[PDB]
Symmetry: D2
Subunit: 487 residues, 4 copies
């Protein structure tokens, strides 16, 4: 309980413990190649993310077999591919004479959705590819343009394709940039006709996850669940919370989803910037309770794109997201468009280890069990129980055999302060298990009087990582028993 004595004792300096939080990294043209993909994975990259906001399936299919290629050149930790939906966003039209950039000072103008002005639009009018904004929008609303650099107080609603508006601030109007609707119930499908194809393209191409952008409600999840199809039942749906509709509803959404990602980016544009701080820790905490894998993402080491050294805020943000309960850390343009991607993963990583040597494992564990123990599913009771075991005997590991990634995810929920060695035969679960914090998957084959072998796989596999020293003390899990033998 001595938070103050926990704090006053932080005893810094990254020690012997292996990083437990998986590092998600977006890939750009630069980073798309085995050699780099390797220096990246070696440095700490766990999962790879492909933003389907740009790029042809050629542009992407490339990335995959390249990662698959890095796996060939040197397997190391199993890597995971993940599709990131180009959700229902808003791209304004193009400026007439190409790159012409008229400059509104704080004047009145007019946005329209006619396409007649698509390629030919600027200063006087503006195109927006969301044919319905006129319905979902209302005079008084404030539209934002290009990373919310521009504001537009909705003055009126002309026609039903026309919108009288006024620049609330300066800047020059450019072409094709994202439009943000702060405080407007968008009816856009979380998934579009193309998105249905990108998913289907991913499923086919065997990507393990999906980060559905701009999720507003549970149905949206249910929808992307079936669109994924029977062949994609085994793939994870990582809801992306980046708007009010997605927060003023998170709870019912958290229910049906597999995971959740604090899509900081738009979220920070969508709602007030300062609000995030609380709207972040709140969703991670809520996630933790639900037991589902959460991910913090965007601008963590943003500056580490043009620079080799990250800032104070960035470092002291990577660590915090972990203290708040994040299961994974992301990297967007620091890997898909930056000069120092190797250092990126390398700084994130280094910070995660110091950020885990500060956690209050015992008390945090208790708090988590004092929430809805009544109950508790048998796998979760054994989950919590095993965790307690190590806290007592000071166990070093906690080998658990699985296929659904259920048993190791639950233990994860109970955040042990020792490696969670998951021995599995299913290759798929071993890849998407980097979603749950602290889980070190390994794939075992051949084929309950045989599980001792699998347990010897994880033990020896643990030994190679220097996690067990023999005559140590580990806890196993399987059918639902619970072991606690020695090395």
């Amino acid at each position: 309980m001595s938070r103050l004595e926990r704090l006053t004792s932080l005893n810094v300096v990254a020690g012997s413990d292996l990083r437990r939080t998986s590092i998600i990294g977006t890939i750009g043209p630069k980073t798309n190649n085995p050699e780099t993909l390797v220096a990246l994975r070696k440095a700490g990259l766990n999962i790879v993310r492909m933003n389907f906001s740009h790029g042809s399936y050629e542009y992407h299919k490339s990335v995959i077999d390249n990662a698959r290629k890095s796996e060939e050149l040197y397997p190391g930790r199993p890597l995971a591919i993940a599709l990131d939906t180009k959700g229902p966003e808003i791209r304004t039209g193009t400026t007439t004479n190409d790159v012409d950039y008229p400059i509104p000072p704080n004047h009145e103008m007019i946005f329209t959705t006619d396409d007649k002005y698509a390629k030919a639009c600027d200063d006087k009018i503006m195109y927006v590819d969301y044919k319905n904004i006129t319905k979902v929008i209302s005079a008084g609303r404030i539209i934002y343009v290009d990373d919310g650099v521009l504001s537009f107080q909705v003055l009126e609603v002309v026609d039903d394709k026309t919108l009288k508006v006024k620049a609330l601030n300066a800047g020059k109007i450019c072409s094709h940039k994202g439009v943000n609707l702060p405080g407007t119930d968008v009816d856009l499908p979380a998934l579009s006709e193309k998105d249905k194809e990108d998913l289907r393209f991913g499923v086919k191409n065997g990507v393990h996850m999906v980060f559905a952008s701009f999720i507003r409600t549970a149905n949206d999840v249910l929808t992307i669940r079936e669109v994924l199809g029977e062949q994609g039942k085994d793939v994870k749906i990582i809801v992306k919370i980046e708007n009010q509709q997605g927060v003023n509803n998170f709870d019912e959404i958290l229910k049906v989803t597999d995971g959740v990602m604090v899509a900081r980016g738009d979220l920070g544009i969508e709602i007030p910037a300062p609000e995030v701080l609380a709207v972040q820790k709140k969703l991670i905490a809520k996630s933790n309770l639900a037991g589902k894998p959460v991910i913090c993402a965007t601008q963590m080491l943003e500056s580490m794109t043009y620079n080799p050294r990250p800032t104070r805020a960035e470092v002291s943000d990577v660590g915090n997201a972990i203290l708040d309960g994040a299961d994974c850390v992301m990297l967007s343009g620091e890997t898909a468009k930056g000069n120092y991607p190797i250092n990126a993963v390398t700084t994130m990583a280094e910070t995660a280890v110091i950020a885990e040597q500060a956690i209050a494992y015992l008390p945090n564990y208790d708090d988590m069990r004092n929430c809805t123990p009544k109950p508790t599913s048998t796998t979760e009771t054994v989950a919590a129980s095993a965790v307690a075991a190590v806290f007592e005997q000071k166990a070093k590991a906690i080998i658990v055999l699985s296929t659904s990634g259920t048993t190791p995810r639950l233990v994860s929920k109970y955040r042990p302060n020792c490696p969670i060695i998951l021995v599995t035969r299913c290759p798929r679960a071993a890849r998407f298990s980097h979603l749950y914090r602290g889980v070190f998957p390994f794939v075992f084959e051949k084929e309950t009087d045989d599980v001792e072998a699998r347990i010897n796989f994880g033990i020896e596999k643990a030994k190679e990582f220097g996690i067990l020293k023999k005559g140590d003390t580990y806890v196993s899990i399987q059918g639902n028993t619970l072991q606690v033998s020695t090395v």
Copy 2:
């Protein structure tokens, strides 16, 4: 105790409560003028900081009477001037043809301290104003240049003014930038012959604080205490921790000092970057226990220099520093060299209020009293006690009369979840009291059967801030009694 239920309930959105954490802001040539100094103070600037690393006393004396000037144009909250020692640093020579910037790739070159190459130096040689590094330095050591963006494995020691070296990383060599000596006992004094003058200049000029850069030990503090002199007894010494010598000793230093500032900048260069995360919270926690005012500083909204919108890390770093116990938030180049200084204070501010509506006031309060209660100085017993009072009766304020800023600082230590109205006659204490988190000073004059008036000053003064609604409930403190009347 329900940290999870505290977290899951965060209920964001900046509400009615007034910001309690004072905002420190460095001033640059741009920001130096009343009009701006006002828009700044209005937005939230509490204290002003002048980095004595550059600028003539003309360059500075200006800043002061300009702030004093903003006080004239419109007093608002009392403002505080603060000198920031140009500690014992090491600035490199200049590049020959002015701004010429040769680019080392990872080559061997040679640093020298001859001054014959001071103004004329680059690519082949390099000047350093620390004539002794040759002695304190040793082959194997790793020199850092400009925010440690560059590294230099000390290859050898040529002559005693020459040092064979190799760029451990890329970059282009520029002129006049700070040199960091990670792992080298520097023999330069926390205070120099000039520094003794800058302080004396400040004392004379009535600056309320001093942020001694590069403090290594307690003596250093004792020294700057006497250098300050009798006329400067009433001014605060805010130790700046930016090296290992300052951490591997913090505890004995904390003793004698008034405050402490996590000089993130060099500190992050001095010691490992990731290390800071823990080395930050640890020092703030230690400070809190000691009860002395701590300050977080540098790169909090760094990007908010070239941009109007801050990043995710930055926002979710301003708030965190406050959760970790910081009494004040700083702003370096976001005010002294940035394009959007008004937005800076304006974003910091907005975040601080959301960051204080997340704290666990009751439990944090308890934890703090369970550390060395034995005792406890009478002013601290009354301090803690009063705080408890408000926690029971749900008090809105806590008016305390003082002159030493002792009584209000201690209550501060016990972080009440309501405004701490300090009524005073001493103008000086009312200015430097923005050092202690949550204290809202006000100056009262004229001149114990009269304190009821001063208490009516704070109450009415509280009312103007909408802190009391009459028939509310407040707790007073004075001689040592403890009140608890109604409005």
Copy 3:
């Protein structure tokens, strides 16, 4: 929190601390005289109790001026007289040839209420002074006789003055003993026509309390409150819980009452014996929360009537009642009919001191403030607050001036681990203040720039008790301020 480490460290042996729990002692013919009344008071008797179940007003008026007489011979601690209502009970008739005691084995017989058999009754019939039982009673009901040593399954209802019955157990039938009706709504008033006189007699005679026997509901209290009258507003009503009607309603009763006494005796007859254990601690705990003075009573050192040494249970019951929160300990026949009354108070006493050196003052204090702090009456906020003060500075005392016994009772509620010196001018409050645990009243006369004197009364008065050593540390309370000066 370390209950186990609190337990494992109990470090027994009555030490220096003065007993804080007042000792209530009933007086019998034997004990009625100054000399004895003194040896009793000297040994520890605080309050005296007169059971109005027997004795003429001559029989009683005697006791009073005899105690008043002991006060004369030697004042010592101020003593308090207390009337104990001869509540609506049911006494059985007398056995024919005087003390003849027929012995029923498990036979059928017949209870009647004819008075024709009052003085002449036994074996075949039995008299009961409750003329209505026939109505309120019903075949199947189980009557209890003399400390419920005998049981009587109501076989039938003969006539309306006759009741066919069967001894459910052995024993010999004697004369005049109390009859208990477990599970029968008795229509007799908490107060009777005579009781109204005994109270009025007591008020007149200046007895400070009243222990209303057999209270069933709040009205009963309200009734005895007005019966007491204007002249008896200043006297305390100590509800006696000895039936189901009184428990299945305690909460609404606790509201309006001043105190509450766990009338163990009948209560143990009324409801199951084992049930008491929980039905005891529950009512004391509930009392503590409400802040009203509770008293444990009956059979604590029962055997210490015929013997000089008490039993294990008795000793380890006197202490427990105190751990459970009792403000006072009683003595019935161990003082009003026993051979060793001096040893009784002397054993109770000795045990109370060991029983208070085992309490968890800090944690118990916290728990108490975390129940309805919202608020909290100003006198209670100052109450709780002062207590906290001593916990910090390790205060030895806590002098509080009062007249209502409000301020010292509330502090009491917050059970400080140091003497609560109440300085008063009202003699009455100083007598009934032995009701609140830990309060050491003292009477001060003459007659806010003077309270320093009264505070010097308590301090010096504290010194005579060796509670303060000068240069110690005490906390005062008065108008509502809160002091904390030194000795």
Copy 4:
């Protein structure tokens, strides 16, 4: 943590839960016969105790096969026989003309150890069978005679067989009564030449325990361990703490022993009576930590010997001993010399159930694990762990297979709030397992792919006790795994 809300919610009335604390009952001539021995066992008697302070081996061997006989007539719960050493006590000589009883008022006299006055002693002199008191005793010491009813200030030491003494109080000197030496290091062997025989007699006769009276040090235990011999390795040594030597050393003694009993009787004579209160809870708490079975004994329902109804103190002492952590409750003369032994066990029992519905199972559990978890033996880690399991899933039972009574004892240590069904093949462990609170042993025969049967023994055996309702939830333990299947 809400002790107050735990207390305020006690919700009395013995409910559905089965008593978990075993009831130890001493047998007298009266109680020695199957019929009674049965009504006793049926009512709740778990273990039987034979005080070897009196009775011939004929007097005792009788008791055993009578209990063994009650087992025959109707097995019910397995019963356990236990020998209770006639430790090194002190019986004064006899009065000359037989029952002559001279009366000392407060005079000086003389105790001697010559035997010449053995049968012929009184008024002038006194015989004591402890030939060494003269050495171990010292002028100033205070001897006690017959239940400490008499005191004797050691005036001087005449000769080395003579002791000048003075009656510190009145009374008449009788023959053969126990002499107590408060504050005198007795060198008497905890075991005597005869005791060595009584044990050996017991071992042979297959009694499961031994309650060594008057233990002073660890050696004493070690001694009775070897005297017991190889054939008695499987029998339990229940140390009896009844003197200062045994408390001022408990910790080193607790080490090597199996159990511990708070021999209240002499202990209360040995040391101050009030002291016990703390010296009781302290030893039980210390026992709990050590994990060894503790027993509270003597005078719990003392009065329930001559009366059918117990007192308030007694009831509210039986329950308390259980709250303080006692694993077993005893009954001395309430069974071996009383008129109502059936009611005795029947009241104890009834109280134990209400006394277990008040415990704070969750918090008490935590506290226990936060003491020395480092560690922790694998059987204890699994022990603690399983307990936690039930707390989560709200398990009803916790079947554990054993032979050493190790696994079920440890779980016991972690006091689950559900029945601990121990399935065993060893008849001996099933009998002495009533030593550990909450354990419900059952014997299973025949003869790890078979343990499912034994688990089905306990489950079905649980069902007969109505502990499981099928589709409930239980936790198993065996080789060291840990199960958690359903019914």
